[PDB]
Design an enzyme around this catalytic site. Sequence first.
Site, PDB file in Angstrom:
ATOM      1  N   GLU A 119       0.825  -1.203   0.000  1.00 15.93           N
ATOM      2  CA  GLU A 119       0.000   0.000   0.000  1.00 15.93           C
ATOM      3  C   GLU A 119       0.863   1.259   0.000  1.00 15.93           C
ATOM      4  O   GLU A 119       0.485   2.268  -0.592  1.00 15.93           O
ATOM      5  CB  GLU A 119      -0.952   0.042   1.202  1.00 15.93           C
ATOM      6  N   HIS A 120       2.018   1.201   0.655  1.00 14.95           N
ATOM      7  CA  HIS A 120       2.902   2.359   0.702  1.00 14.95           C
ATOM      8  C   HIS A 120       3.622   2.576  -0.620  1.00 14.95           C
ATOM      9  O   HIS A 120       4.141   3.659  -0.871  1.00 14.95           O
ATOM     10  CB  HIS A 120       3.932   2.219   1.826  1.00 14.95           C
ATOM     11  N   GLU A 175       4.678   5.003  11.550  1.00 15.76           N
ATOM     12  CA  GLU A 175       3.229   4.849  11.642  1.00 15.76           C
ATOM     13  C   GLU A 175       2.895   3.837  12.728  1.00 15.76           C
ATOM     14  O   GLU A 175       1.837   3.923  13.353  1.00 15.76           O
ATOM     15  CB  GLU A 175       2.628   4.393  10.311  1.00 15.76           C
TER      16      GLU A 175
END
Lengths: 423, 146, 42, 42, 99, 22, 442, 49
Positions: free
Chosen positions: G60-61, G137
Site C-alpha cells: 500500500e505504501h 506509523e
Amino acid sequence: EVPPHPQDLEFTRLPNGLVIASLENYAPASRIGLFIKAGSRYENSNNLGTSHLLRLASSLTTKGASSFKITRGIEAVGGKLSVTSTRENMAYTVECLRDDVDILMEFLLNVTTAPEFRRWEVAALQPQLRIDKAVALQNPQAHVIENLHAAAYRNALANSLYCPDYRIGKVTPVELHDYVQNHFTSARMALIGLGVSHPVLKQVAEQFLNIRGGLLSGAKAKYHGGEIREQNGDSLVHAALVAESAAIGSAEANAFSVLQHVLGAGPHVKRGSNATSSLYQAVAKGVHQPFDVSAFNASYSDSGLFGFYTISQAASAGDVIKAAYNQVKTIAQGNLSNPDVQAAKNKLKAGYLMSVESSEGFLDEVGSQALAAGSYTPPSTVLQQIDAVADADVINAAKKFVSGRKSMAASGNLGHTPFIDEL
Amino acid sequence: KAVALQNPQAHVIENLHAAAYRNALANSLYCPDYRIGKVTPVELHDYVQNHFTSARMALIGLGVSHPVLKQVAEQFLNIRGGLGLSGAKAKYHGGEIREQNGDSLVHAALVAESAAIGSAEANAFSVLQHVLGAGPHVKRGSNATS
Amino acid sequence: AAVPATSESPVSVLCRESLRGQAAGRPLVASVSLNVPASVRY
Amino acid sequence: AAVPATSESPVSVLCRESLRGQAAGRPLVASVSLNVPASVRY
Amino acid sequence: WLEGIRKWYYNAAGFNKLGLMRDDTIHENDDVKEAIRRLPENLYDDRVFRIKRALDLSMRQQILPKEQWTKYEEDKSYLEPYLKEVIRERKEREEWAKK
Amino acid sequence: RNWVPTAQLWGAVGAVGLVSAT
Amino acid sequence: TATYAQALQSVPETQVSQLDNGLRVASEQSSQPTCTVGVWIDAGSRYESEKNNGAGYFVEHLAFKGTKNRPGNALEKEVESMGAHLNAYSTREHTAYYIKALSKDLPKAVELLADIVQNCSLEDSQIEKERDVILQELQENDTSMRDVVFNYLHATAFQGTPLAQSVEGPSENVRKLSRADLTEYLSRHYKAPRMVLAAAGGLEHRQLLDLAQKHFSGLSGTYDEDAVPTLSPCRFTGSQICHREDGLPLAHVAIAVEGPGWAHPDNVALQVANAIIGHYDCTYGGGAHLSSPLASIAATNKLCQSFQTFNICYADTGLLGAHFVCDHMSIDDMMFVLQGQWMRLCTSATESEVLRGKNLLRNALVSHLDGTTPVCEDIGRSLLTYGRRIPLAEWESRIAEVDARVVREVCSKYFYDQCPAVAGFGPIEQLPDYNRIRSGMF
Amino acid sequence: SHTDIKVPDFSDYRRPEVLDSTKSSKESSEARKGFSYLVTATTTVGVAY
C-alpha cells in the site's frame, strides 16, 4: 443501470423574505435544514457564547414537545437532529426516512420557533459548554483558527464559535430567548429540503415560519490585523498567516479560490509528495524535518481571510513560514505558468463538484447560497465563473496578500516562531 | 498564581510585558498554566547553577558588621560557573493583548519604550510620571494636583 | 443518528505522511447532535 | 515570620474614593514566604 | 356552606397559626422534591424561612400572634405551576414506557 | 415473554422439590 | 414525491459483467458529474503468513509511488493535475485502491488504476524509504488506544490463526521484508478472479466494461493450480488479554463473542440488536433521555466517555460485541450494564424497541450510501463478500421480517452462555475477572 | 510496536476438541459446556440429598 430524474432544484422567496428551496431526488431518506443568519458574529461583548449554548440546546423543552419527547420521538423513527454553526450561520438539520418527515419537521419547528429555555434545564446544560469546548480544543487547528479571527477583526467575525470560559455558567435563559427573537426571523431564514415536495415544504414555511421583527441588520466586520501567540510547548508549532481578501460571492473571491489551489490546498494522494503543491514544494526544498503547509481561504458575507497555515517542528517554524511566504511573493511578482493556473482550476472545479455530491454537502451549499445571495447558482455556472478567472487575477490576489496588513496566530513552543514584523 | 491573579492589575501588567517585548522582559513572573506540574528537578538545578553565581550576586546586611558579612561571602559565596549563562538584550516590540472577561470595570495600560534604569533620561521619565500623577497623597482626596 | 461519528470523543503524529492534511485550509464549523459525536471542521 | 500579612489569601469597589490608588504605577514584584502570606505589588 | 366550611377548616387545620402557607405543608415525594428544586430563588428562600419559623414555634409549642397568621384569602399556591408540570412530565414518560 | 416458560419451569421445580423433599 | 418503499425501487440496479480473465466489472449509474472508480481485491493480512505479515500494508505504501509507464511522482502529478483523488485501504481480508474524479475523466482514471495494479515499480530505494515511514506509523498507532485494543481483541479471539495478525505486521517484518516477498505476495494474490473493478456515478456500464477490456485484459487469470490461495476457517477462543498501564488516563475495553461471518442472514437481526443498544459519547445531546438503556444509564451516571456496539464480519466468523472508554472506577459498572443489556435482549426484547432498532438500521443503511465513494465501495466489497450487490429493497425485506422473537432467538444464539474474548488497556485494575465476565453471559 | 504482541501458545492446556486452529470451536462448545455443567448438576443433586 438507467437512473430515473434528474429533477431540478425549486426555489421560492416568500413575501416575508424567507427562502424555500428543495430537490425531490426520490431518495429513501429526506433531509431538511433550516438555515439562519445567527452565527457567532451576531453576538456582542455582553452576550459572548450565547450562540454556542444555543447550539447545544436543541434538545431542551419547547412549547409543543418536551425534552424527553424530542429525544425519544426522533430516536423512535431512527432520525437525526443536528445543529451546525459557522461564524455567520446556524443550520438546524434533521434526517429520517421519507415517511417520517412530518414528525421531524414538527420537532424542528418546535426547536427553532418555540423553545422555552427553562431556567433549570438551561442551568443543567451549562456544564456541557465545558465538555463541548474541551473536545473541540483538543485539535490545535481549532485553537489557531479561533485566535486568528480574534486577531484579524475588531468585532463580529472576531467572535469565537465557542463560549468564552468566563461565560460558562453565566449564559442566561433571557439571553437565549433574546438571541432567538433577534435572529431567528423569516427575513433571516432559508428552509432547504432534499427528498421532499416543494409545495409541502412551502406550505409548512408559510404556516409555521412567519416570524416578524427581530433585527436584517448587522455591523460590517472591521478587519484590523494583529497577532495572538499561544505558547504551550508542543513539539509541533501550528501557525497561520493571512491578510484580508474578498467577500464571498464577489469575482475577486474566485481568484483567491484559484490562488489557493495554485498554492496547495490539501492532499490528493494518500502518502503522496504533493508534487503539484507550490507551497509544499518550496518548503520541502528548504526544510528536512516533517512538516505540512497549506493555503488557507475563508470567505464571509462582508470580508475574507487568505494566507497559509503551517505545522512544523518548533525549531523550524520560522524557516517554514518564511519559505511559504517567499513562495507567495514569487507569485505576486508575476511568476505563474498558465498550466499551473489550469491545474489549479481543475482541482478547484473537481473539488467543488465532489463537495456537493452527498446530500449533506449539497444541502449546506444550497442553504449557504440561499442566505448569502438569496438565489441558487448551478454547478455549470460555478465552473464557468472559475474558468473566467484570469492568470492576472491570480497574480493580483497574491499581490493583495503580500501588501495587505497581516493577521497571525500560532500555538506551540514559539521560541523560533517569527512575529509579523520579522516576515 | 490564582491568589496573585485575583488582582486584575497582575493580569494587565503581565500581559503588557508580554505584548511589549519579543523576549526576556516578556516573560511572566508567574508559571504558565501548561508548565504547572512539568517543571523538573533538573530545570531547577540548572537555573540555579546558571544564575546564582558570585558575579551575579550582592549580599546586603543591616544590623550586622561588614567584616563578618564579608568573611561569610568569601568563605561560602565563591560560586563558579560565575557570570553564569547570562541573557540577551530585551527587544521592545510593541503590540496589544486583550483579555475579555466581563468585569464591570476595565483595567488598561498604554505604554511606549522609555529608558533603561540608571540613565539620565530615566530620571526625566520619573519626573514626568509625577507631573502626570502617580498615586494618591490624601485619603479620599480629589487628586487636585494629578 | 443511526450512524456513529467518524471519531467518538472523550476527555499523535510522528511522520511527514501522517502530518499531510493537518494544516487547516477553510473557516471553522462546529456541529452538535442529538445522536452523533460533535465535530469541528477546519 | 511573626507578622501576619495585611491580607490573608484564599481561593469589591463601588466608589471613586475606594478606587483611587487601584491603578498600577510600577513594575510587578512577587513575594513568597515561609511564615507570611504571599504578595504581589503593582 | 362548602366555602363557608372551607374558611372554617383552614383555621381549624391551623398551619396558618405557625405562619405557613398551604403549599409549605405538602408531603414531599419525588414529584414535590423536583418541584421545589425548580423554584426561583425568592420563592425557595421564602419557603425555607417560613418552614424554619414554623419548626421553631413547634419546638417551643407556641404559635404566632393572631395578626400574623396566614390569611385564608391571601394564601396562594406558589408551588402548583411547578408541581403540575413535574407530574405531567412523569406521566408522559410513563406512557412512553408502555411499548 | 420468556417468563411464562421460565416461570413454568420454576413452578415445576418448587413442586417437585416439595413433593420429593417433603 | 414517493413513499419510503417506492423510493427503494427508485434505485438504479447495479450492473455486473465479467472479462475473460475473470475480472468482475460492476457499476451503478447516477447523474453525478463526478464519480468514484476503484479496484477491490480479496487480499489482506488474513492471507499472510507470519513471515510476510505486513506485505499488503507495505505494498500500500508503494502503490502510488510510481509505475513502469509513470515512474516516480509522475502518476501523482497526473492525478493531481486533473483534480482527482487517489486513495487506498487494507483490512484483514480486503484491499482497495480507488480514485475520485470528474465523470468525463473516467477513461484516464480506469487507465491509471490499471497501471497501478499491474505495473507498480516497487523500486528498491522506495522500499527502503517506506520501511521508515511504516515504522513511524507503527509508533503513531501505539498512541491510539482504540487501535491497540482492537488489534489486541483480534490477537486473542483468533489466537493461533491468520486473523490474529494485525494488518500492519510486526516491526521485525517491516524491517526485513524484501522486494521478493512483496512480488511473491502480489503474484499469488493479485489475480483477475479475485478483483472487482467498481464504479459509481455519472457513467455507463458499457463504457466502464469497454475500458476494462481495454486496460485489464492482460491481467493474469491464472497463477496456476499450485498457488490458488485459499482461506481455512479461523478458530475463535474465549479468552482475555489485559495490558495494564495505570499511566494512561482512561481505560479502553473491547469485548466480543464469535460472530457468524459475512454471508449469514443472521447479521440483519444482530445489526438490529446492536442498534437497540447503540453507541454513545459525552458530546451527545440526548443524555438521560436516550432510548438505549445503556446510553441513558451511562449518561446519567457518568459511566463512560463513550461506547459503541460493533459487528465485525469475516468470511466464516467475526467479532460481535462492544467497545467502551471510561474512568478506572467505572469499568465494572459499564461491564455489568452492557452484559445485562445483552441478556435482556436474549430473553426479553420488546416489539417496540425492536422496531426502533429496525428504524435505526434502515436510516443507517440509506444514509451511508450517500455519495459516489460509499456506493462505489459498497459495490466492490459486496461482490467480493456476497458475490452480488444486495439492493436496498432486499435489505428492507430482511429488516422488515425481524421482530422481537427473531431478536431474542438470534441474540440467544450468539450471546447466551457463550465464551467472550476480552481486551483491556490502561488503568484496568477494576476490569472484571474472566470468570465473572463469563458468568455475566447468563 | 503493540503489533509485536502475540498471545502465547496454550496448546498444552487446551481441551483436545479445540486444538485445531483451522476448525470452528463452536462445533464442540455444547459438548464442552455440557461436561462442566454436568459436574455442577450432579454435585447439586448430591448436596440436595
